[PDB]
Write a protein that binds this DNA or RNA. Structure first.
Length: 128
RNA sequence: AAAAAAAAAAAACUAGAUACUAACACAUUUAAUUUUUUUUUGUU
């Protein structure tokens, strides 16, 4: 609802196409921070809603090291960037499980401690 | 024929009739800043 507020102003002025859009600030970014998730949505189900706008190559769900349950945020890289422009913009503020999730562009830095979780995820997304 | 040493209207209630006052106020108002509220939970 922070970002959703921008695009309405932006569009209203007829900004139209990325050169003048704030989405142009990125261009080298693909991963999207996916916030305010419900707790029971897992990687496969976050890999349901987000293929509407593109083809995901990677995904990471943030979850506590001990109990292994959702922190409530994920990082999902689309194959073709412009999906990011599309997902952030179009799907932000949308309800799943009662709570309206947040998306925004992100620069994502991998962490050693999950290293195996990368191949374990990749191998499934490497199937396609 | 005379001198008459100067004061009367109401009030209340309820409705109705009509003037009027106060340079009263009348389209601007939005670039620092508080309605910005949630069971904390956004990662070298």
């Amino acid at each position: 609802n922070k970002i959703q507020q921008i695009n309405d102003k932006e569009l209203q002025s007829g900004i139209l196409s990325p050169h003048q859009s704030w989405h142009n600030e990125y261009k080298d970014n693909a991963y999207i921070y996916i916030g305010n998730l419900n707790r029971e949505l897992t990687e496969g189900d976050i890999l349901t809603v987000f293929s509407e706008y593109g083809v995901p190559v990677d995904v990471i769900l943030s979850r506590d090291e001990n109990t292994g349950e959702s922190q409530g945020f994920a990082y999902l890289k689309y194959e073709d960037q412009r999906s990011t422009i599309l997902a952030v913009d179009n799907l932000n503020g949308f309800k799943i499980g009662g709570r309206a999730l947040k998306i925004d562009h992100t620069f994502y830095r991998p962490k050693r401690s999950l290293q195996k979780y990368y191949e374990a995820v990749k191998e499934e997304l490497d199937r396609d």
